[PDB]
Every structure is written in structure tokens, then in C-alpha cells.
Amino acid sequence: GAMGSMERASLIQKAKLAEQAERYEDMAAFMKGAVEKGEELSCEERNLLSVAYKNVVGGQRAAWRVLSSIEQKSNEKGPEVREYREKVETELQGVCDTVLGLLDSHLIKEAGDAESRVFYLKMKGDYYRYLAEVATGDDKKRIIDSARSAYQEAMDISKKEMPPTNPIRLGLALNFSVFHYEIANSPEEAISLAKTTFDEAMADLHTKDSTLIMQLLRDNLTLWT
């Protein structure tokens, strides 16, 4: 595709240039580029992937929210705001469906360092979650099953082979739980895991940046309870 002709290492250098210039569209395009090569990504590369995708989909989800909100106070008048809301909703689904293709097509295989098999399964759950935040109907149904399947296979792996301070295991559990509350409408399952996790981490805290996740991880229990 659009980067087919470019050397993998150049794609990677240009991702980094993009990041410096604050051009996440670019950065994501370059990374989709490298990924599409077929070489397994290093830890440092994967951080470029997620970071870029996250900022892109991030601003979309912002605008979506601004707009749904205006479409709430527009229920007490014109289609203009529903129309535009749908526009942004459609771009977002776009990016999600793209990132979800990378994971299904290249990144996830059932053969890898495993500490990152997680990173991907997690990423799969988050992007499927982002689709859930905007879907309706049976669409919303299936997407929910999917964020569950992934986030769960990522839990198994993270428990079995990851110490409970691993900012991966932390972040993952955090996410999976936000999903439990915000999406699947199951605050029992949500509170349990939010507690348990922050438990078994406050435990080995003796071994200092996972603490930021832990700040949030509890920060969430405030409102949940």
C-alpha cells in the first residue's frame, strides 16, 4: 500500500520524526507501514504503534463525546448535529477497524515472547471497547463478546507469566475493569478485579511508575463505590 515501497527502518525513523512533530496521523500511517512488513515488533516499536493509534483514536473519542453531549441538550431542532456526530463516529470506527486488522493479521500469533502476546490481546480489547462505546443493537452485542474474549485471554497469560507490578498486567486489569463497569454493565465483576489487582500489587510494592496505574486503579473505586 502507500508505504509498500519504503524500507522498514525508514518507516520506523519517520514514525519517530512524526512523534516529534506531533503528527499522529502520519505516525500511525508509518507504523501500519512497518507492521505490514511481516517482522515481529520490538518493545520499542510497539510503543510507537500504540502511542500513535492512541492519540489518533483519542481525539476522535473526544469529539464524539463533545458532540453526543450537544445531542443530549438537543432533546429539549435540526439534523445538523446528529449528521456531524455520525461523521465523526464513522471515522472512528474506521481507525478502530484498521488497528483491529493489524492485530488480527500480523501482530497476534500464538507464538511469541508472550509478555507481549498480552500487549496485543490487551490492545485488541481496548479498540473493541472503543467500538463498543459508540455501537448499538446486536453490533453492540457481538463487539462486547469480542472485547471479553480478548481481555480474558490476556488475563490468563498475564496471571500465569507476569509479576503483579508489570505496568502491562496493571494497565490491562485496569482496562478490563473499566470495561466491566462502563460497557458490560457488571460493577460486581468490576469492583472485585479492581480490588484484587490493586491488592496483590500493594503487596509486592517493595520491588515505581506502575504506581501511576495504581493511582488510577484506586481512583476508579472512589466513584464505583
Ligand X SMILES: O=c1[nH]cnc2c1ncn2[C@@H]1O[C@H](COP(=O)(O)O)[C@@H](O)[C@H]1O
In the chain the first and final C-alpha atoms are separated, in Å, by: 49
Q: Which DSSP letter does residue 134 get?
A: T
- When CB distances are held under 5 to 8 angstroms depending on the partner's kind, the choice from ligand X, a second copy, none that residue 43 binds is none
**Are residues 95 and 131 in contact, defined by beta-carbon separation less than 8 angstroms?**
no
As a whole number of angstroms, the distance between CA 124 and CA 96 comes to 9
From 45, 216, 221, 224, residue interacting with ligand X (rule: CB under 6 A) = 216
Three-class DSSP category at 99:
helix
Residue 30 vs 130, nearer CB to ligand X: 130
Q: How far is the CB of 114 from a second copy (least distance, A)?
A: 33
Residue 67 vs 178, nearer CB to ligand X: 178
Q: Is the dihedral of CA 145, 173, 63, 25 positive or negative?
A: negative
Q: Taking each helix axis as running N to C, give the angle between helix 8-21 and helix 43-70, from 0 to 180 degrees, rounded to the nearest 10.
A: 50
Q: Is 146 in the site for ligand X (CB under 6 A)?
A: no
Q: What is the DSSP string of 36-57?
A: TT-----HHHHHHHHHHHHHHH
Q: How far is the CB of 211 from ligand X (least distance, A)?
A: 13
Binding site for a second copy (CB under 8 A): 10, 13-14, 17-18, 20-23, 26, 59, 62-63, 66-67, 70, 78, 80-81, 83-84, 87-88
Q: How far is the CB of 89 from a second copy (least distance, A)?
A: 12
Q: Which three cell numbers stand for residue 64?
A: 464524539
Q: Which of 192, 147, 153, 194 is nearest to 170 (CA)?
A: 194
Q: How far is the CB of 216 from ligand X (least distance, A)?
A: 5
Q: After which residue numbers is the chain interrupted with C–N beyond 2.5 angstroms?
A: 76, 207
Q: Is 174 in the site for ligand X (CB under 6 A)?
A: yes
Stretch that binds ligand X, among 134-142, 151-159, 171-179, 202-210 (CB under 6 A): 171-179
Q: How far is the CB of 188 from ligand X (least distance, A)?
A: 19
- When CB distances are held under 5 to 8 angstroms depending on the partner's kind, the choice from a second copy, ligand X, none that residue 14 binds is a second copy
Q: Is 175 in the site for ligand X (CB under 6 A)?
A: yes
List residues near ligand X by CB under 6 A.
126, 171, 174-175, 178, 216, 220
